[PDB]
Nucleic acid binder design. Sequence first.
DNA 1: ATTATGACGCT
DNA 2: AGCGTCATA
Length: 430
Amino acid sequence: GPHMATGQDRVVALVDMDCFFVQVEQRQNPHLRNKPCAVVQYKSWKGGGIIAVSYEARAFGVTRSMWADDAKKLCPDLLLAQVRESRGKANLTKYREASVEVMEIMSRFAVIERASIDEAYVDLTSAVQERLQKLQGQPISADLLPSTYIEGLPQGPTVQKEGMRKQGLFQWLDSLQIDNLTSPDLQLTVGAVIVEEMRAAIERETGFQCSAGISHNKVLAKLACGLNKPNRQTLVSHGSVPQLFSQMPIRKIRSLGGKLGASVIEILGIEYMGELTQFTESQLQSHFGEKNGSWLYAMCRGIEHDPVKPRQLPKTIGCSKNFPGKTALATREQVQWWLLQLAQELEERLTKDRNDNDRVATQLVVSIRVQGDKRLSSLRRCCALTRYDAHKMSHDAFTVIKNCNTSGIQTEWSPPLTMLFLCATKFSAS
DNA sequence: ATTATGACGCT
DNA sequence: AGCGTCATA
Ligand SMILES: [Ca+2]
Ligand SMILES: [Mn+2]
Ligand SMILES: [Mn+2]
């Protein structure tokens, strides 16, 4: 009852750019705007692999991971933008720099956690308190929430999408307890007002549109964000969770999309997140471990305490390339040339990082895959990263992997290598 | 031949 | 440390 924590102490948002690499290319090339279009890497093999898809193209059934030749079968007028190639590999610099544009704007509002190239979490708890005292107990107008959905509304006793959105928003605002500075629903609402402002700032200053979720923790904020994309934001209140979770497939919740989520489903014989409430914490811990069990017990009730980490910059800088099928590297000269290509891009990014961010990487991680191995990585070895020099890094990388060569012939490499990966880690301030 | 990443957990 | 899981464009 009175001592039952309800996980309503924070206001957390997740902001995620719509079709992000597509928007980056559409900003650059106005001919691609408002068209079915996609971003592709490489070209020779089946027109290249698709990694981002505009909402116009999604309407034709175009998806990520599709070959462009195959996407063209669904959407013959599909427009394509190719990822840059440098040193024989895809180079994602344009998108990393565009990401920085967005992250720097968000950081003006609050501490952010960079969660991917195109999204960040925001802890808005403090900003909400300040906006609340500024408002002087004044009601919140629907005009301050022009792109917000309230999940679960309208309900109770119009056939247009925007009309439904407004109906739900009106019901929500009509009910609001604006006299209480500590009502969690009011706090989320003010959070949503700030996120409208954040999203308006991002679009004004970059041209990029985004969606957002506003809730009491990161998992619900992430889930909320996807409920009404593109170019909209969704408030998921504590109260909305039972109905929301009652038909929510378990795999939709962050961290349950894989083997663990599959095991929750199989072992417990359930399908939806809400069904987890019928197990004791000990029962869940017995099947899924102490940490996962406690997390599941609280999460199915809408409660999670994972903090928004103060981290705007990536913790690692990596360069990787696959060498599929017949392109697998079979000679020492081959392996060494590509290590050099990778190491040269890595040096470029590392040197830029050192100047921009006042830090230095101190460890080099080298990873490879061998033909025949199903695993993403076959072997991972580390060595010291003492100098930002590509020739040294590539020589060092070779030294730590060269004994993987099962060939009796030195010149040859067996089994052939189907992936190389160089990753700079363990940064220290400089 | 689904590619290039990046964070974090386990032992 | 090296490996595995889960995640996003
Ligand atoms: Ca996105
Ligand atoms: Mn994203
Ligand atoms: Mn996506």
